[PDB]
Nucleic acid binder design. Structure first.
Ligand SMILES: [Mg+2]
Ligand SMILES: [Mg+2]
Ligand SMILES: [Mg+2]
Ligand SMILES: [Mg+2]
Ligand SMILES: [Mg+2]
Ligand SMILES: [Mg+2]
Ligand SMILES: [Mg+2]
Ligand SMILES: [Mg+2]
Ligand SMILES: [Mg+2]
Ligand SMILES: [Mg+2]
Ligand SMILES: [Mg+2]
Ligand SMILES: [Mg+2]
Ligand SMILES: [Mg+2]
Ligand SMILES: [Mg+2]
Ligand SMILES: [Mg+2]
Ligand SMILES: [Mg+2]
Ligand SMILES: [Mg+2]
Ligand SMILES: [Mg+2]
Ligand SMILES: [Mg+2]
Ligand SMILES: [Mg+2]
Ligand SMILES: [Mg+2]
Ligand SMILES: [Mg+2]
Ligand SMILES: [Mg+2]
Ligand SMILES: [Mg+2]
Ligand SMILES: [Mg+2]
Ligand SMILES: [Mg+2]
Ligand SMILES: [Mg+2]
Ligand SMILES: [Mg+2]
Ligand SMILES: [Mg+2]
Ligand SMILES: [Mg+2]
Ligand SMILES: [Mg+2]
Ligand SMILES: [Mg+2]
Ligand SMILES: [Mg+2]
Ligand SMILES: [Mg+2]
Ligand SMILES: [Mg+2]
Ligand SMILES: [Mg+2]
Ligand SMILES: [Mg+2]
Ligand SMILES: [Mg+2]
Ligand SMILES: [Mg+2]
Ligand SMILES: [Mg+2]
Ligand SMILES: [Mg+2]
Ligand SMILES: [Mg+2]
Ligand SMILES: [Mg+2]
Ligand SMILES: [Mg+2]
Ligand SMILES: [Mg+2]
Ligand SMILES: [Mg+2]
Ligand SMILES: [Mg+2]
Ligand SMILES: [Mg+2]
Ligand SMILES: [Mg+2]
Ligand SMILES: [Mg+2]
Ligand SMILES: [Mg+2]
Ligand SMILES: [Mg+2]
Ligand SMILES: [Mg+2]
Ligand SMILES: [Mg+2]
Ligand SMILES: [Mg+2]
Ligand SMILES: [Mg+2]
Ligand SMILES: [Mg+2]
Ligand SMILES: [Mg+2]
Ligand SMILES: [Mg+2]
Ligand SMILES: [Mg+2]
Ligand SMILES: [Mg+2]
Ligand SMILES: [Mg+2]
Ligand SMILES: [Mg+2]
Ligand SMILES: [Mg+2]
Ligand SMILES: [Mg+2]
Ligand SMILES: [Mg+2]
Ligand SMILES: [Mg+2]
Ligand SMILES: [Mg+2]
Ligand SMILES: [Mg+2]
Ligand SMILES: [Mg+2]
Ligand SMILES: [Mg+2]
Ligand SMILES: [Mg+2]
Ligand SMILES: [Mg+2]
Ligand SMILES: [Mg+2]
Ligand SMILES: [Mg+2]
Ligand SMILES: [Mg+2]
Ligand SMILES: [Mg+2]
Ligand SMILES: [Mg+2]
Ligand SMILES: [Mg+2]
Ligand SMILES: [Mg+2]
Ligand SMILES: [Mg+2]
Ligand SMILES: [Mg+2]
Ligand SMILES: [Mg+2]
Ligand SMILES: [Mg+2]
Ligand SMILES: [Mg+2]
Ligand SMILES: [Mg+2]
Ligand SMILES: [Mg+2]
Ligand SMILES: [Mg+2]
Ligand SMILES: [Mg+2]
Ligand SMILES: [Mg+2]
Ligand SMILES: [Mg+2]
Ligand SMILES: [Mg+2]
Ligand SMILES: [Mg+2]
Ligand SMILES: [Mg+2]
Ligand SMILES: [Mg+2]
Ligand SMILES: [Mg+2]
Ligand SMILES: [Mg+2]
Ligand SMILES: [Mg+2]
Ligand SMILES: [Mg+2]
Ligand SMILES: [Mg+2]
Ligand SMILES: [Mg+2]
Ligand SMILES: [Mg+2]
Ligand SMILES: [Mg+2]
Ligand SMILES: [Mg+2]
Ligand SMILES: [Mg+2]
Ligand SMILES: [Mg+2]
Ligand SMILES: [Mg+2]
Ligand SMILES: [Mg+2]
Ligand SMILES: [Mg+2]
Ligand SMILES: [Mg+2]
Ligand SMILES: [Mg+2]
Ligand SMILES: [Mg+2]
Ligand SMILES: [Mg+2]
Ligand SMILES: [Mg+2]
Ligand SMILES: [Mg+2]
Ligand SMILES: [Mg+2]
Ligand SMILES: [Mg+2]
Ligand SMILES: [Mg+2]
Ligand SMILES: [Mg+2]
Ligand SMILES: [Mg+2]
Ligand SMILES: [Mg+2]
Ligand SMILES: [Mg+2]
Ligand SMILES: [Mg+2]
Ligand SMILES: [Mg+2]
Ligand SMILES: [Mg+2]
Ligand SMILES: [Mg+2]
Ligand SMILES: [Mg+2]
Ligand SMILES: [Mg+2]
Ligand SMILES: [Mg+2]
Ligand SMILES: [Mg+2]
Ligand SMILES: [Mg+2]
Ligand SMILES: [Mg+2]
Lengths: 10, 137, 122
RNA sequence: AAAUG
RNA sequence: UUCCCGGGCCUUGUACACACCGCCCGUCACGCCAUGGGAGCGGGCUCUACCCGAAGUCGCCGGGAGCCUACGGGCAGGCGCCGAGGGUAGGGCCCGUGACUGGGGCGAAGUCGUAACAAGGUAGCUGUACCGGAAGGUGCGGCUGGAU
RNA sequence: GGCUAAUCCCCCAUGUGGACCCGCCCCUUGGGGUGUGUCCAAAGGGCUUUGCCCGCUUCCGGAUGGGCCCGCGUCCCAUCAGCUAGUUGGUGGGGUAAUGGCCCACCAAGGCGACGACGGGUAGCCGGUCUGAGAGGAUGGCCGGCCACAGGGGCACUGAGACACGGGCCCCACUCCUCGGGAGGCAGCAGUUAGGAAUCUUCCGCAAUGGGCGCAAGCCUGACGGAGCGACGCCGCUUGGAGGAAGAAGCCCUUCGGGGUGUAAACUCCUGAACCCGGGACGAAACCCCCGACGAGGGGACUGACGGUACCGGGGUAAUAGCGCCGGCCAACUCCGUGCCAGCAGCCGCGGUAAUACGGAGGGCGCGAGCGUUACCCGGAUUCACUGGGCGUAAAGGGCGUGUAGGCGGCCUGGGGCGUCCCAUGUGAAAGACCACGGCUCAACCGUGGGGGAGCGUGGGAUACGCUCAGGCUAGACGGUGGGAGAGGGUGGUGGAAUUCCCGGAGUAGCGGUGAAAUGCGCAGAUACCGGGAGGAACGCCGAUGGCGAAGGCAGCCACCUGGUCCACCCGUGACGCUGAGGCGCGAAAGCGUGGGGAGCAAACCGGAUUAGAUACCCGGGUAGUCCACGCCCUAAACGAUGCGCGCUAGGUCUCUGGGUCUCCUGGGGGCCGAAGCUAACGCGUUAAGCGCGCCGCCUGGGGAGUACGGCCGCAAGGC
């Protein structure tokens, strides 16, 4: 879920 | 032969469609009671007990309408429709309030009751229900 | 079938297969765009239609359509989606709800602007 | 005998 | 009037109707999607045997020994069965995930041939078997949903 | 460590009664009543005070709230088919209020399951709610009934009652407070936080209703009664009403004449939502006090959170409109921009320069404090079909038998009354629903009556049909006697024709083969011909549109064993039947195992031609196999693409096999054309695909795919 860097994980 | 009653009804239905004067069915007192209603309500002229090769039958005298004009002279029927309701596969019983109206009164519904074989009209009067044998019009 | 067979086996109730699987019961569902690109549709159409690969709150990732003319959607844009597919673009089984989260309304839109999330103009 | 649009 | 090109009428087959310059099949290359398999890896539930075992009721004891008395008794206290759970070991089902792998679907103005639909140019279809880049071919038997 | 009260605790007494053992009467599960032995009660406090009031004690009945047990009902998966040691039952006992394997010791070996045990998935269930012509489907939030849980688990204590949300213990996880550990349990009412697409005020009051305790004033009450936020839903109301040009401007269209918005506006008069001012509740008469008696009855008083609210009066301002759609379904049409771009999209489909389908605009349609979208339920869907569908070719008859269970079953007489049917009676709470009345200005919302039904208990009644027991019957069925046709099946034997090889003889220049050829064979003597041998496989004519078999399928001839079947006579049995999930057997070809056998033929395979190629079609070779025995496999265009039995509905013609009187009539098979009828049509039609009943199997859009997983089977291939 981790994205290149966003305090949004999903 | 699994159902004697359906047989009859159909012997009849089969007979009228070629406009046979009569047709015989194997004899039974219960078939008679049903036959009784068929004539008294005017679906037939009537019936008489007979014998074929020592075998009791009920000969049934068929009834039809006036010859017709047009490219097809074939007359209308007295019995347009006769078909089983209650069957050996599915037994069908009604209580008095559930007894149906055939073709809005125009036709009858025969049913076996503890007060005998009666019509729909006849049952509701006598106030009883039973095995809904068939419907005719 | 005979009445008896019906007593034995019975009639079999049909079931309904939802056409909106990722939604997991809900009316709408929140998410973020991982990919934002254009996809050409299947015959007999030609276009560059607007889509987003979107990551669901249910830890799902669906391909979703971007309605309107033009958009403010990019990678990392938080977005809201709704059901209904786009026939010409296979795999896109959901629509982006414009005018919610980082999904802008359509600039200059005057007709049916509730569907395209545009506030009433001057 | 003898292919394809 | 056999042949080639065009045409008229009758009939017959058709999966053609953008009407044979029609239709259409499988591999192979590319892209996307979902699924199976996979040395395994991670979780959930669950079952069996055994070890330890709290509180607590029940049962035994209450004596080298305390307290109470209403002492042929009671209470504390000591033992025991069961017991939440913990632990060791081995099973059963479900889910997720996995280098790689299998075919599948879609995409398309790609590559190869042209198997099928007209007797489709070797009638087709079939179960099976063997072979072949691919459609497919061939054997054996069956079907007509074929021959005109 | 010690003092002391009571409705606290204990003993003695008393005994209406009750408890217990035993005997006996009534009863009939442990229900009553006796007799004897023995065992059990208690608590006092108040005022005004030779009396009433609240308390206590044993027993008996009522009433209300329960516990336990039973019948029937209650989701998906059989790709879950077997499950069970306290398991099932007996004995004795423990335990409770009480029955019970609830618990214990022992004894016996039982209990459950295709009517679906066991296992897995999912769910609190009902009144009801939603949809639907109904049948049915879906659902169980709010209100009412029951159950379950109170962080996760176990436990018991006190008690009428709990194994107890804001009681107790103990283990765990987690957090908290500052070394011994003490501490917590909002799934109460608000509130925070996290999750989410999303879900309310840390509000007011005990005034009412209602609960606990109290002789009673009253205390407590986040139950509750109100208020707060949110168009979340339904319901009611507004942004005006009458007048106002052949018709402002502006914009949109235009045939350049005009047409449109549109009486719409502007403008006139009339009204007067909001707002101001005043008055202002119903909900509240009880408990209490008073006379009588602290009863009956009559009279006093008290108190309202919402609230200065509703409502009623005086005034009083023209005072918010937005949303969807306008290709067809589907109500609403025209300019411009764009040019398979931008975009629309529920489906069919729009966009490639003149788009009613994209974006704006004018205009139009539709609803309106809403309009739309998304999600889900029922509907339309007679598309799981009970109501109310189907299976020759559209999806669908099982490859064929045989048969277990089950489902169904001729004629007649009677017994029972089980299904079935009628009547009474009980139940079917309340709310909801339905009709009528009525209350808030209607309504939404709310009262009061009326109508009930299914379903189950009970009592009576009926007996045609189904059932059951009982008695008979001969039409179904099955036997007896005599007779028939047939490639039906198994074993063995055996006859000719042909192909091939081998020996012999005779003979010579080619034979073979194709579209034409070539490969191949041939002076090492082929082909063509004659004689003789060997061996395998298939049986020409008869032969048919024929015959037989359940299907697969069966063909020279003989004999032996053996099945099905038709006829006649009308002798025997007396419904002994039809169908048939599972089960069992049979099942072409190809294929597999072990031995045989191997002439012809022939996958693979080699070669010769054709062809761009030719892993084919054609030609010359050729191995498995084709054959036999035994054992497997279990497929199919295993087709009539038509399950089986029965009854019923013109005939015409051909044929096979019987019996008769022999023109012909009658049976049983096989075809054709056709009555009625069926059919989407083609076609079917006494060999139904017609009209009907019984039972079974099967279908539910195409692809994925008869694929995967599981399971069973198999040597494998592979099958279900
Ligand atoms: Mg297009
Ligand atoms: Mg709109
Ligand atoms: Mg090509
Ligand atoms: Mg071509
Ligand atoms: Mg020509
Ligand atoms: Mg001519
Ligand atoms: Mg022609
Ligand atoms: Mg045609
Ligand atoms: Mg994969
Ligand atoms: Mg996988
Ligand atoms: Mg151990
Ligand atoms: Mg232990
Ligand atoms: Mg002692
Ligand atoms: Mg244990
Ligand atoms: Mg354990
Ligand atoms: Mg532990
Ligand atoms: Mg997995
Ligand atoms: Mg795995
Ligand atoms: Mg071809
Ligand atoms: Mg071919
Ligand atoms: Mg060819
Ligand atoms: Mg061909
Ligand atoms: Mg063909
Ligand atoms: Mg083949
Ligand atoms: Mg190659
Ligand atoms: Mg080949
Ligand atoms: Mg063949
Ligand atoms: Mg054809
Ligand atoms: Mg004292
Ligand atoms: Mg005493
Ligand atoms: Mg035991
Ligand atoms: Mg006992
Ligand atoms: Mg007992
Ligand atoms: Mg037990
Ligand atoms: Mg034992
Ligand atoms: Mg649940
Ligand atoms: Mg319906
Ligand atoms: Mg339905
Ligand atoms: Mg409820
Ligand atoms: Mg709900
Ligand atoms: Mg509820
Ligand atoms: Mg607990
Ligand atoms: Mg909690
Ligand atoms: Mg706890
Ligand atoms: Mg618990
Ligand atoms: Mg409880
Ligand atoms: Mg409690
Ligand atoms: Mg507790
Ligand atoms: Mg609490
Ligand atoms: Mg707290
Ligand atoms: Mg709370
Ligand atoms: Mg809150
Ligand atoms: Mg959030
Ligand atoms: Mg509230
Ligand atoms: Mg109160
Ligand atoms: Mg009260
Ligand atoms: Mg409060
Ligand atoms: Mg409102
Ligand atoms: Mg006006
Ligand atoms: Mg004018
Ligand atoms: Mg005008
Ligand atoms: Mg104007
Ligand atoms: Mg004008
Ligand atoms: Mg009042
Ligand atoms: Mg007085
Ligand atoms: Mg005022
Ligand atoms: Mg006023
Ligand atoms: Mg105005
Ligand atoms: Mg609309
Ligand atoms: Mg409409
Ligand atoms: Mg229209
Ligand atoms: Mg195009
Ligand atoms: Mg453009
Ligand atoms: Mg639009
Ligand atoms: Mg179309
Ligand atoms: Mg055009
Ligand atoms: Mg245009
Ligand atoms: Mg438009
Ligand atoms: Mg449109
Ligand atoms: Mg309204
Ligand atoms: Mg639907
Ligand atoms: Mg039906
Ligand atoms: Mg159908
Ligand atoms: Mg069949
Ligand atoms: Mg079939
Ligand atoms: Mg039977
Ligand atoms: Mg029976
Ligand atoms: Mg009968
Ligand atoms: Mg009865
Ligand atoms: Mg009611
Ligand atoms: Mg009224
Ligand atoms: Mg009422
Ligand atoms: Mg009898
Ligand atoms: Mg005989
Ligand atoms: Mg040879
Ligand atoms: Mg020689
Ligand atoms: Mg020589
Ligand atoms: Mg014989
Ligand atoms: Mg006789
Ligand atoms: Mg007799
Ligand atoms: Mg049978
Ligand atoms: Mg076989
Ligand atoms: Mg074979
Ligand atoms: Mg094989
Ligand atoms: Mg092999
Ligand atoms: Mg072999
Ligand atoms: Mg061999
Ligand atoms: Mg070759
Ligand atoms: Mg070749
Ligand atoms: Mg050859
Ligand atoms: Mg050869
Ligand atoms: Mg050979
Ligand atoms: Mg055939
Ligand atoms: Mg078919
Ligand atoms: Mg069968
Ligand atoms: Mg036959
Ligand atoms: Mg015949
Ligand atoms: Mg005949
Ligand atoms: Mg015919
Ligand atoms: Mg006709
Ligand atoms: Mg005929
Ligand atoms: Mg005939
Ligand atoms: Mg049909
Ligand atoms: Mg369907
Ligand atoms: Mg599908
Ligand atoms: Mg499908
Ligand atoms: Mg297969
Ligand atoms: Mg398979
Ligand atoms: Mg498998
Ligand atoms: Mg093998
Ligand atoms: Mg089979
Ligand atoms: Mg099959």
């Amino acid at each position: 879920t981790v994205x290149p860097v966003x305090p949004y994980v999903x | 032969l699994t159902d004697p009653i359906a047989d009859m009804l159909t012997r009849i239905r089969n007979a009228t469609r070629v406009y046979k004067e009569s047709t015989d069915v194997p004899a039974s007192r219960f078939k008679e009671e049903i036959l009784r209603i068929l004539a008294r309500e005017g679906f037939i002229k009537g019936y008489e007990r007979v014998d074929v090769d020592g075998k009791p039958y009920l000969r049934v005298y068929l009834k039809y309408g006036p010859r017709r004009q047009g490219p097809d002279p074939r007359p209308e029927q007295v019995i347009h429709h006769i078909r089983r309701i209650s069957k050996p596969g599915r037994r069908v019983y009604v209580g008095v309030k559930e007894i149906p109206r055939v073709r809005r009164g125009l036709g009858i519904a025969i049913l076996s009751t503890s007060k005998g074989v009666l019509t729909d009209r006849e049952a509701r009067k006598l106030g009883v229900g039973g095995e809904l044998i068939c419907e005719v019009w | 079938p005979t009445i008896n067979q019906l007593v034995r086996k019975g009639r079999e109730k049909v079931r309904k297969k939802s056409k909106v699987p990722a939604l997991k019961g809900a009316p709408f569902r929140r998410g973020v765009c991982t990919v934002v690109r254009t996809v050409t549709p299947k015959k007999p159409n030609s276009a560059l239609r607007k889509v987003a690969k979107v990551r669901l709150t249910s830890g799902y990732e669906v391909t979703a359509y971007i309605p309107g003319e033009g958009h403010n959607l990019q990678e990392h844009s938080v977005v809201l989606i709704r059901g209904g597919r786009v026939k010409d673009l296979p795999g896109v089984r959901y629509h982006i709800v414009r005018g919610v989260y980082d999904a802008a309304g359509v600039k200059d839109r005057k007709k049916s602007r509730s569907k395209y999330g545009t506030k009433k103009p001057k």
